[PDB]
Structure formats: C-alpha cells, structure tokens
C-alpha cells in the first residue's frame, strides 16, 4: 500500500543516551546491512519529512525513450550500378551503450516495448535535382520469416508481418510491442550454452556461444524507401527510440564499470582502468 | 538462558550434518527459501522426479588452499555438483532440472590469524573471456570446471594464439570477473568470513532463473565467488597457509523428461 509518491518516514526527536543498547555496533559478516537513522547515533529534533521517492521507482527510471539503433537506407538513380540500400537490423538493446547499462542493473526483466521512429533524409550528390516526399516501410520480420533479399521482392507484401508506412515530414513513428519473451522473464545475462557437446559427437557439432540463448531472439526489422528510383540520390537515416514500459525487474547486479565489448560480458584491454588517482588523506 | 547462540549452528540434510561454533548467522538469498514447483508455475507435463534425501544432502568439494598470493576462486551451480552421487546421476538423466542450494564455506584459523573472505552468490555469474579478438569465445570445457572449479586473476592477459585459442575465462578479480567494480559485489546475497570473528559462510539459495525449470546441463543458475577482501596474514611469517572447504547441498530438486544418460564432452 505504500506508493511511490509517499512522504518518507519522519525524523523523530531523540535526546541524550547512556544505555546497554548498541545501535552503533554491528557485524558485516552476517551479510546484513545495519539499519540505522540519524537519531540512532546523534541527538535529533523532530522533522516532518517532505521528500518522496516518487521518481526513483522502477517504472520511472526507464520512462525515457532511448536510441537503440540507426538504420540507413537510400534511394539511388535508376541507371546506377549499386543496388538501392535497404537495411536489416537484428533487434537488440545491446548495440548502443546507454540503455543497455540501465537494463543491466538487474538480472531479469519484463516490459511492454515501445519503439519510436525518427527518420531524416538528405541528398548526397552535388546537383540541384528533386525528390518528392519519401515514404518508408518498416517491416518487422519475426524469427524464421522470409527476410527480403531485394528492395522490390515478394517479401514486402507483408500479409502477416506488422509494418508501418511512414510518410516523411509527419510526426515520428510509433508502435507497441508487448512482453514477447519465450521465457518467464527476459534474460540480460545467460550463463550457459545453447548446445551440449556430447562425447559421441564431434566437438564442432556440439559447440556454441557463451552467453547466448537463441541467435534469433526477437527478429529483424527491415526498412526500405517505398518510392521508386529517382534521378537524384537521396539517403535516409531512421533512428529507433525504445522506451520500456510496464517494467519489472529481478535481482540487482553491479553496474558495468568498464566499457562494453561485444554483446557479451567480456572486456577489452586498454579500458581496464575506471577509477582515477586520489590520495588517501586528501579531501 | 539455555545458551542459544548465533555462532553455534547445526544444519542437517538427509544423512549429513554440519555443525559450527563460530558462525555469523545465516543468509537466505532474497529471503526466499528453496521450494518445489507449484502447479501455478508448472511447465513440463510429466511427473517430476524429486530425489529428496537421495540428492538433498551436503556434498564436499575438494579443498582449496589460501595463501597471500591468492587472488580468488569460483564455481558454478549445478555445474560444481555434476559428479556428486545421485544428484549428478539424476542430473544427467533428465532434460530439465531445478534446484536450490545450501552453500556452506569452511575456513578456520587461529585468533592470531587475520584476513577476510567474501563468499558471493551471483545468479547467472557470467565471467569474461580471454581474447581481444573473439568475444564470448570460452569453450564449454572451460566454462564448466566441475568440482575443482576456477580462480580469479590479478591481471588481464589477452590470449594471442589465434592458431588455437585457449578459450577460457580470464576473470579479473577487481572487476568481479565481469566488468564491474568488486566493491559493488555486496548487492548479491553474501557473507564475509573475517577470521577474527567467524569461521564459516552459509548461503541458502533458492532456484533463480527466467524459467520455472531449465536444462541444467546447458545452464548454470548460481555462481559462488570467493575473493580475499583482506589478504592473509599470520604472525611475522612469510608463507602462511590455511584451507578452504566447500560443502554444498542441493535442495528441493526436481527433474523432468527422463531419457538416456548424457555423457558430456568435459575434456
């Protein structure tokens, strides 16, 4: 019943003391933190506490949208040699640093996921040519579904896939995705392997990655310019912003101290130094 | 009155009994006691096998040594108990398995000895690689060092042999072996054996995972990391030595999907 926006426990006025009770003495061998408050050690007056923990609630701590990835696509001229650039990105929070570390404060989580799409385009070649306002399809390809090989192949029919046709210039795109995990919680860290190396099998056949569950965990997004070739080249950058809503978490873990290296927990050399120089007897 | 103390503890599981006269109470991880799967959270349809007394008993892992040189030590559960009586037998015989533990670490000395050992319990204790070229490259055979377990190192030394990698964990002590400052290791359930005070660490651990029951062969639930917070010191000596012994007891263990035995390639 104690909500987030509740006033914190008050400070009780306590006077001088000379008794056989020892708030001050403990033993951190027990693993337990000694739970004291100012009054326990020094004389205090009465204080009606006003501050609340309101903002520090798990839900509020993740209430911000965050850039997960930057997908780049383009629409070149018809005569061109290179193909029209259409991107495919494996949906994961671990491509960027910020949001990841925040999510790493715990062992597991559940959250309905909100994605936002900020598209931004421009020309590239020195020319005064023209491009009419461009549209963009963002097709979510769940694991196993046919990944588009061309920018104009059958896959874009999306008879079952959930897509979003964004018209450039209008407000950023947004879609809601519930907790879609195969487990009873999303796993930030997975101490194990997908395969088991059997003895009646060759090492190769039984080998897999350390820390990985399913290579394809959530699927890929596919983004393409819908409008056809235009004599003047136009490149586009779609920025995805994720805001984890309705979030729950379990078992806290120490926050990442050294820079990330790969999708794993691994650390690169040359970054193994986080704390600076400070003399013990210097304030 | 009758003389009941926090230091004096007698734990009993099956046909094994652990006593102690210098304890510092006991730790129930996240306040939850280990338990059997409730119909509400059940997942596999078959009748689960609960070995009970057959597997729910203390198993002593070979004793390691502590010297001024020691950086650290680590194990994985259920991994560590992979070859402990029926628990292992049952473990290898089923596709799924969930178990909790009563971890008791033993390390005594004299009132003239000094130091501190932090036995940490980390659910999903992922450790870091040894290559500056290949992420997440530690091979299964090095990921699961059984009852002998592993250690922590004082320096990160990359593996350069790209002709045949060493594929092991290089878990830097101060980084708790996972890129985070050791000083924060207390967020995990823990006890610190500080020689002058106690002589043992008892950490009861419930089953913790993202799934109700999971493949034990493939995945380790908990992690037991022991690193000397205070280095070992004895008298005016240059080479002191005292042993550390780990006895872990699986609790409320249940296994589903009975099939032929898995003979893993451990070497």
């Amino acid at each position: 019943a104690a909500t987030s926006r509740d006033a914190l426990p008050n400070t009780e006025a306590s006077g001088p003391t000379h008794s056989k009770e020892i708030p001050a003495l403990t033993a951190v061998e027990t693993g337990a933190t000694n739970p004291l408050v100012p009054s326990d050690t020094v004389q205090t007056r009465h204080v009606v506490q006003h501050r609340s923990r309101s903002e520090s609630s798990i839900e509020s701590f993740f209430a911000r949208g965050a850039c997960v990835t930057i997908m780049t696509v383009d629409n070149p001229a018809s005569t061109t040699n290179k193909d029209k650039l259409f991107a495919v990105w494996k949906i994961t929070y671990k491509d960027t640093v910020q949001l990841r570390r925040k999510l790493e404060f715990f062992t597991y989580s559940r959250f309905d996921m909100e994605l936002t799409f900020v598209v931004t385009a421009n020309f590239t070649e020195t020319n005064n040519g023209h491009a009419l306002n461009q549209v963009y399809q963002i097709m979510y390809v769940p694991p196993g579904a046919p990944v588009p090989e061309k920018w104009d192949d059958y896959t874009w029919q999306t008879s079952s896939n959930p897509s979003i046709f964004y018209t450039y210039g209008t407000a950023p795109a947004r879609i809601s995705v519930p907790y879609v995990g195969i487990s009873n919680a999303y796993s930030h860290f997975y101490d194990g392997f997908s395969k088991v190396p059997l003895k009646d099998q060759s090492a190769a056949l039984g080998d897999s990655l350390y820390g990985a569950a399913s290579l394809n965990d959530f699927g890929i997004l596919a983004v393409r310019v819908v409008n056809d070739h235009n004599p003047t080249k136009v490149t586009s950058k779609i920025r995805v912003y994720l805001k984890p809503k309705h979030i729950r978490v379990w078992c806290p873990r120490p926050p990442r101290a050294v820079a990330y290296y790969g999708p794993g927990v691994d650390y690169k050399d040359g970054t193994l130094t986080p704390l600076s120089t400070k003399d013990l007897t210097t304030y | 009155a009758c003389g009941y103390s926090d230091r004096v503890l007698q734990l009993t599981l099956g046909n094994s009994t652990i006593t102690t006269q210098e304890a510092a109470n006991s730790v129930v991880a996240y306040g939850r006691w280990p338990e059997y799967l409730r119909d509400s959270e059940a997942n596999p349809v078959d009748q689960p096998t609960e070995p009970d007394v057959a597997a729910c008993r203390f198993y002593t892992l070979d004793t390691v040594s502590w010297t001024k040189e020691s950086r650290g030590w680590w194990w994985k559960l259920p991994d560590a108990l992979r070859d402990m009586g029926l628990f292992g037998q049952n473990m290898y015989y089923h596709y799924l398995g969930r178990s909790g533990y009563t971890v008791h670490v033993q390390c005594n000395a004299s009132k003239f000895h000094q130091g501190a050992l932090g036995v940490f319990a980390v659910p999903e204790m992922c450790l870091a690689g040894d290559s500056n070229t290949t992420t997440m490259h530690t091979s299964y055979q090095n990921a699961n060092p059984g009852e002998k377990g592993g250690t922590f190192t004082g320096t990160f030394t990359p593996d350069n042999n790209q002709t045949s990698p060493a594929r092991r964990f290089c878990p830097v002590d101060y980084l708790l072996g996972n890129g985070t400052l050791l000083g924060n290791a207390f967020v995990f359930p823990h006890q610190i054996i500080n020689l002058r005070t106690n002589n043992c660490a008892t950490l009861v651990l419930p089953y913790v995972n993202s799934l109700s029951i999971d493949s034990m062969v493939k995945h380790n639930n908990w992690g037991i990391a022991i690193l000397p917070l205070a280095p070992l010191n004895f008298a005016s000596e240059s080479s002191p030595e005292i042993p550390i012994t780990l006895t872990i007891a699986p609790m409320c263990c249940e296994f589903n999907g009975l099939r032929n035995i898995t003979l893993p390639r451990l070497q």
Epitope: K90, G262 | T135
Partner: nanobody, 120 residues
Framework: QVQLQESGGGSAQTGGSLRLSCAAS????????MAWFRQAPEKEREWVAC????????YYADSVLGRFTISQDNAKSTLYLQMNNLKPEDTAMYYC?????????????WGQGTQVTVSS
C-alpha cells in the same frame, strides 16, 4: 541487404584445388561465426566448416578434414575456402553461410551458391 555472394567456380579434374570465396556486406555483427555448407547433387544439405567471427579458430567436417581450408579476411570482409585434393564425393554445390551461427547450425543469411565438379 547483407549481401552474401559466392565465387570460386567448379570444374576441376580429380585431385586438384579451388578457391571458394564469399563477398559479405550489410551488417555482419562480427561476433558469432561464419561458415560453409554444401547441398550435394542428391543428398541433404550438409555442414562443411565453420570459422569464428574474426578468430581463426575453426573446425572441419569429418568428410573434408584437412582437405578443405576455411579462413577469413575481415579487412576485406571476406571468407575463403581453399580446397585441396578434390574428389568424386566433393562434387557438389557450396554455400557461404556466414551469419549469426554461434555454433554450426543457425542462420539468417545464406548465399546463392555455386557448383563444383570434380571430374574423372
């Protein structure tokens, strides 16, 4: 648009050697593996060999052991399959399956493949 395009041909005499290449693009998130697969004329698709992300740690198929060599050049973002001692069993199509992996089985990107023929 992770474009995987094989090359290397396939029309050698029995016993020779060929160099099977594969141009990779798009976003190959290094970490994982990169490999080779064969379908054969009339058999099931079979795994040939897999090499680690950037690491030169690899394995080979029992059938091809030592007679096939799979490397990489992540500077050139390519993978190579040198094949010495080609034989009548090696006559088949070869595919550069280099994406995700994590092991020697999972994929989200394949190529168009190329045929090899060891005649005699």
């Amino acid at each position: 648009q992770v474009q995987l395009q094989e090359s290397g041909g396939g029309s050698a005499q029995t016993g020779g050697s060929l160099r099977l290449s594969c141009a990779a693009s798009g976003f190959t998130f290094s970490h994982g593996y990169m490999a080779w697969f064969r379908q054969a004329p009339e058999k099931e698709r079979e795994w040939v060999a897999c090499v680690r992300t950037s690491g030169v740690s690899a394995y080979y198929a029992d059938s091809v052991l030592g007679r096939f060599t799979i490397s990489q050049d992540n500077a050139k973002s390519t993978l190579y399959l040198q094949m010495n001692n080609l034989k009548p069993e090696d006559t088949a199509m070869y595919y550069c399956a280099a994406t995700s992996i994590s092991c020697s089985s999972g994929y989200m990107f394949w190529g168009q493949g190329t045929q090899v023929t060891v005649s005699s």
